[PDB]
Amino acid sequence: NSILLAAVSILSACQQSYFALQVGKARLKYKVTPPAVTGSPEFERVFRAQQNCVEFYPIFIITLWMAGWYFNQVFATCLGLVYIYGRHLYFWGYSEAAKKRITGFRLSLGILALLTLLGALGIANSFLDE
Amino acid sequence: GNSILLAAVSILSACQQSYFALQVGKARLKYKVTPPAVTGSPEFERVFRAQQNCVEFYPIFIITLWMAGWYFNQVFATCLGLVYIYGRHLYFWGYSEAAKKRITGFRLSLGILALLTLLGALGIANSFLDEYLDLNIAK
Amino acid sequence: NSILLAAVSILSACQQSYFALQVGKARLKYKVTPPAVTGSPEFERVFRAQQNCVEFYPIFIITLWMAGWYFNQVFATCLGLVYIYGRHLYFWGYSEAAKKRITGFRLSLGILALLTLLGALGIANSFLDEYLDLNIAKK
Ligand SMILES: CCCCCCCC/C=C\CCCCCCCC(=O)OC[C@H](O)CO
Ligand SMILES: N[C@@H](CCC(=O)N[C@@H](CS)C(=O)NCC(=O)O)C(=O)O
Ligand SMILES: N[C@@H](CCC(=O)N[C@@H](CS)C(=O)NCC(=O)O)C(=O)O
């Protein structure tokens, strides 16, 4: 069983594709011609927000699966849901103003350290039984 | 094991990505762009942006590829996987010659990514209704 | 029986987060206010190095697991550790001067390449097991 992990993962991949879509409409609304990524200030906020998310994505996925596999799938899955929401706050907050990114950011960084902690314990815990 | 095809596509796609990184490295030398800068030459700037768009989407493609292959069909996911790799080849070399000649390869690889997403969502769903609610769409 | 892969994977994730933190400390120290990523030579080097690392991360993870799953987990694990070390040289090297990034860059692309090779052999050998040929005949 990894079905809960599997659901959360497909969920998050849809959010990441959505964010990429938001940048695509921002190019048109603020007339920023590829390959440029600068000019309009709110475009730079949208672009930078989507970039920070897309960077951290594989890191969320790995910690998510290690925790779910070596600690508990249901608990990890729940944390996973919380992360997806924190990233929803981060993205939309930042789009409006750089200081509105702060809540969603702290939320998503909290979950991530926890996931790391849980995955690290279960992996450790698992090897002392051997 | 019953993932041997997925593993093969993954390794192929990973080689294409390292290949894209090599071109950026060679473009840096051809147009004399001093690191860590990434602007100055229009032809460099198109190559950099192209590799950037590919390298962003890579983990999304991988998750979508494996979820399709595990919960829907390894052979169908595997075949789409190859075409996606092909589309990104068009996108990259397309964008490199002109900003607007990236579009065919762009629509191809994204169309495919969505189909794979669809399949992954169905199979995961089907497996979920059969494992916590005892309902299979089997008929 | 993927316990070693899991461990290396958690180490590398911590490494990546530590790098992200450096960019954050650099933002405060050289006054680069978000969403800007230019404006200070020392920041731009730290930023660019961290960007190269996080982009290459999923490529390393896939390659690590295909090798570890289809060839040998202990050997893939060891290569994984040396790669994490190469990225350590690369990042701090680049932070001091763009031209001190080259050793760690070479070590880690060397490793990635070895991992890509081993995974390809292992998948091949493993594919022949549904053709019933196993090169346990070379063992
Ligand atoms: C000494 C620690 C062992 C490092 C090897 C395993 C790497 C794993 C941890 C962090 C990634 C890189 C950051 C390392 C943080 C400790 C080293 C440091 O802070 O400075 C290094 C020096 O300034 C320039 O070589
Ligand atoms: N700081 C430069 C050089 C970094 C580096 O070590 N390798 C570069 C080119 S020399 C690379 O392979 N980049 C792939 C990419 O980021 O596009 C950059 O990121 O463009
Ligand atoms: N992966 C991040 C790590 C650095 C980081 O955490 N930056 C914080 C600054 S506290 C951020 O969210 N910056 C907003 C932005 O990049 O636009 C990056 O390279 O930007």
Residue numbers in the entry:
A (entry chain C): 4 to 133
B (entry chain B): 3 to 141
C (entry chain A): 4 to 142
What do the authors of the reporting publication say about this deposited model?
Microsomal glutathione S-transferase 2 (MGST2) is a member of a family of integral membrane proteins denoted MAPEG (Membrane Associated Proteins in Eicosanoid and Glutathione metabolism), which encompasses several important targets for development of anti-inflammatory and anti-cancer drugs interfering with prostaglandin and leukotriene biosynthesis. In non-hematopoietic cells, MGST2 catalyzes leukotriene C4 (LTC4) synthesis via conjugation of glutathione (GSH) and LTA4, a transient epoxide intermediate derived from 5-lipoxygenase metabolism of arachidonic acid. Previous studies of MGST2 have revealed that only one out of three active sites is used at a time, an intriguing catalytic behavior also observed for MGST1 and microsomal prostaglandin E synthase-1 (mPGES-1) both of which are strongly implicated in human pathophysiology. The overall structure is a homo-trimer, with each monomer containing 4 trans-membrane α-helices (αH1–αH4), forming three potential active sites at their interfaces.
The structure of apo-MGST2 (with two homo-trimers in the asymmetric unit) shows structural heterogeneity, while the structure of holo-MGST2, which contains GSH at only two of the three possible active sites appears more rigid. In the holo structure, only one of the GSH molecules is observed in full occupancy, with the other refined to 72%. The binding conformation of GSH as well as those of associated interactions with active site residues differs markedly between these two sites, suggesting that only the GSH at full occupancy is bound productively. The GSH at full occupancy observed in the holo complex adopts a “crescent”-shaped binding mode, similar to what has been reported for LTC4 synthase10,11 and mPGES-112, while contrasting to the extended conformation described for MGST1. In comparison, the GSH at partial occupancy displays several distinct features. This GSH has an opposite head to tail orientation with its γ-glutamyl amino group hydrogen bonded to Tyr97 instead of Glu58 as for the GSH at full occupancy. Furthermore, the salt bridge between Arg51 and the glycyl carboxylate of GSH is lost at the partially occupied site, which contributes to its inefficient binding. In the holo–GSH complex, however, this region adopts a loop conformation with relatively high B-factor within the unoccupied active site. This transition from 310 helix to loop makes the essential Arg104 more flexible, which is reflected in poor electron density compared with GSH-bound sites. In contrast, in the holo state, the productively bound GSH interacts tightly within the active site, which globally rigidifies MGST2.
